[PDB]
Amino acid sequence: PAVSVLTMFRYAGWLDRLYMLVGTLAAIIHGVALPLMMLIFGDMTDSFASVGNVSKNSTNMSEADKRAMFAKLEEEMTTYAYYYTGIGAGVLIVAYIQVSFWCLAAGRQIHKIRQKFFHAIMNQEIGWFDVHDVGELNTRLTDDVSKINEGIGDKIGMFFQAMATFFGGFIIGFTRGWKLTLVILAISPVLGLSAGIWAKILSSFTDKELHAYAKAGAVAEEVLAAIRTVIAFGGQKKELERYNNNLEEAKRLGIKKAITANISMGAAFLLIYASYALAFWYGTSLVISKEYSIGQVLTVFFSVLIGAFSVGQASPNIEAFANARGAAYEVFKIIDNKPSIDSFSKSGHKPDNIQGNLEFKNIHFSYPSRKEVQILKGLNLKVKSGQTVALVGNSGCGKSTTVQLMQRLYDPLDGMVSIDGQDIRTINVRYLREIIGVVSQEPVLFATTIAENIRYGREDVTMDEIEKAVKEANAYDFIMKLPHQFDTLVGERGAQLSGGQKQRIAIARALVRNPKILLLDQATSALDTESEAVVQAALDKAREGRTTIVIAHRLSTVRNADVIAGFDGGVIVEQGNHDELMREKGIYFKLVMTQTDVPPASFWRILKLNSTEWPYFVVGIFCAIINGGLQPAFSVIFSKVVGVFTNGGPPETQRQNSNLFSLLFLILGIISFITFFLQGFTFGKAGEILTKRLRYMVFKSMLRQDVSWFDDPKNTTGALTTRLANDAAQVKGATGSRLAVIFQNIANLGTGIIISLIYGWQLTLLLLAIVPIIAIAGVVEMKMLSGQALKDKKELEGSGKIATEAIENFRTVVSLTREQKFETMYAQSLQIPYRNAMKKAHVFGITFSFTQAMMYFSYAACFRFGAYLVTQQLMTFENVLLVFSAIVFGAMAVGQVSSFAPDYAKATVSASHIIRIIEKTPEIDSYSTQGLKPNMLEGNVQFSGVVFNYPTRPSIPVLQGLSLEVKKGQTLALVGSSGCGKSTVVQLLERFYDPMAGSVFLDGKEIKQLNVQWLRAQLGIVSQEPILFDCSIAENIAYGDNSRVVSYEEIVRAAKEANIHQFIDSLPDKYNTRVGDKGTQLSGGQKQRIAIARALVRQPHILLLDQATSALDTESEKVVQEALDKAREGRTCIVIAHRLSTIQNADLIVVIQNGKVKEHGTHQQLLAQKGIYFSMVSVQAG
């Protein structure tokens, strides 16, 4: 959808309504300013044509004909040169006003939008945030606001310019003779038609492509997330073929786009060369009959094509304006939306002497994300002033909902909530929340100082009072131990505070507010019994004589409360003191007892990647020379035409010369269509090969890498799918397409420099001296349009980061009632990109003005100097046109080439990354073929003094002097405090990493000397969260022993021994059932048993079990443990043990602490040791 145009320019002050008006009048002038440059150019050839044939045919006088005609041209061209400079003078003024006033008026409007849009979001309801996706909302603050500034800025001034030329151009064409124009305007619908057809066919082969690679690029994403399972089971080649057998689809489809894109080029490049002749063949016949002059035609043919091409230059300026209307709809809706609970209004009462009488009356309530089911039904309950009320009951009974209604974050439907006899929906929201202290489940700390985070509760508090509150909250002594005490910087940027310390800050914040009512919703939940005790002392302190509602999770909180309400299904089944509810032996009694990147890759290296198809490259080079030569050809055939009618000739030859040269256009026009159809058929396949061949070599080379690579923060599973998907394809704009450019550019400017130099060399050294100037200008505009894009958009990140901090914790700030503070913080940050943008339009006023002025001025500096060369009989007027339209129309050709081809800079660095991902050789070559691979199936495992550090964060040491044997067929349990040391042993026997020092042996043999495939083939990885692949049960299981004959019989025996056979045989589509996200979702317990079943098929001599049972499925757990006892029997086993019961039946236990084996032995010996191991078993008991 979109907005009405006249709405969208609201918030535009009267001065912005003026700037947009004055700037338009500039745009209209600048629009017609080039049609005038074509009209004069016509009247200039008339001045040359009138004398060009006098001095040649009849030799009447030698020096009385020289001065006669030549002092006429010298006086005619004084005016034509004064006329040209007059335009560029007016342009210089006009062009400034155009882009100045429009970017200004847009900027002035944006700054008024940002504040009104953010404030609109801080003014919304809390049920408003429930329905909406907050992620896209935050980007909508800086993307959609960035999408509007396009379609109200300078993009309008260019539109009214193009329309003033469309009508300004078709005006001049018609008044200078109507026959020539209606010829063209009969063909321009054929070209306005020809343009849109291909864009329907290019858009066709686009969306078909994103669904072609979506098959291949889906296998890619699944692997690189599941890389731990792929390497550990050696399926690194099986995944290469799946990714490849779907990779031919997007290739063949890539060719139908590659051909048809260069068809679209040469097809429309033909209809120009066709309609050139049709308009010139017919245009020459109207000067031969002495109806038009040569100056008349050359005006009209150009003055039409400019005005006719003015539509295609205004295509995107509309699309940017319609994108701006559309993005402006989602925003303006929010600004004009007004809430029922207005957090900014000043309406309700502000009652004083609030004792805290609390009353709920017949409350019913439904959330608006799931409104089908009611959450609370007929809920009634009073809290007497200064008493504490604990809410208990099972999950889903609206305990927090109660607290949300007393915050008034939703408005109940039926019933009434009153404070001291007064409807809470009849006082003001800010006074309400000012009297209420919110202790959330999780405390939000803001990325600011501790002083400010506390002062957020009440911005006028003195530093004396801060000290008092921090004391009362029990957070002072820990603050006294921090290095930057009350100035320490907290949040995501700063030092991470513990859970206990964060909550006490939230408590101090609420104390600063000194409210009359306190609300706590799981104040202590996550916190351990040690952290909880300090908070409880500080909570209890803060409550002393305040009316309190606490969502209680800990039994000790509930036992000392003055009154308990028991909730069940929205309904208070029993209310009383602690002893009553215990006496009742209802719901409450049951609860309380049970609980007890800048790589400089070279152009030559990239080119070598496509070297396997050099014959394709030779042809494309060849046609890139012809097509680069057709431009300077046209500069002749245009000149040689006009030469006849401007230098001298008999009207017997004006027919054959004109029609010949007029049909040499269609010689050129055909050769245009052929050389493009062939250029994009050889360089086209050369690219679509190159993508497909590099995605393979990459994805192959990616699975070759070792685990330290995939552990890095930069090589995440997404940034590799991107790198594997578009960066792999973006290379082809730097192999063949770069030769096509430079061979075109050489064959164009090369052969065009040569020709113009011989026909007259004086004019050329001027033009090829000035082309350097105007060529520079198109770059610095592209630079400073972009170099300024960073500056203005970098100063916005602070302005955007402020908003990000406020939306991401909206439920908090609204409870602190600091919606205004963050609004002000946003606005104050926005004052920098405002004042920068008000200088930006001043800048782009100039870069746009002095581009067109140095072009309109330099248009005079050529046809003045070139004219004096005809006075002095040094060059003909034909030879001027043969210089001018051989440099200029040829220099414009490289731009029309370079702007079509892919962004070369963006392609080289996009390619430089590909070469690095290919040329990288790992520390652990999984692909290799050497290694001992004996027939000795003992599996004696031995770690001796292994020392290892994670190379993601090598500053952290884990293991020091770790030495240990596992005897054949024994089970070894790893235990100790939480740490990565225990997990590391599994990764080293896998050989996912090498160790720094020490030695890992397998049956007396160094694992660095055994093939990585045959080390890992006899090792079973049982992951925490086992990865199940989108695939059949046979394939997910076959992932274990790959490249193997496995039939139906061998599958069933293994599934028995994992204990899943009986459950499998009654399910629908039994062994064929699709599992994954598309298929039946398996529980946590079932997935792990699949991982066990996969390990049984492999039948290894060693079993690595790592943190298995990472789920809560109670029955499955005993099923897993049964299946596990089966899987271990008479096998050498290494278990990372977290559960005490697993440890009891193990043959040997190792207690590890800080890299050090403090003790080890059988179960019985470690208990009687009465050491570390003893401590673990004792804590669970009591």
Ligand SMILES: Nc1ncnc2c1ncn2[C@@H]1O[C@H](COP(=O)(O)OP(=O)(O)OP(=O)(O)O)[C@@H](O)[C@H]1O
């Ligand atoms: N963002 C949300 N949008 C809509 N409804 C929600 C949202 N969050 C929670 N709910 C609803 O709140 C209802 C009651 O949950 P409640 O917050 O009372 O749990 P609780 O009592 O706090 O339990 P616990 O303390 O264990 O989380 C649920 O039925 C759930 O649908």
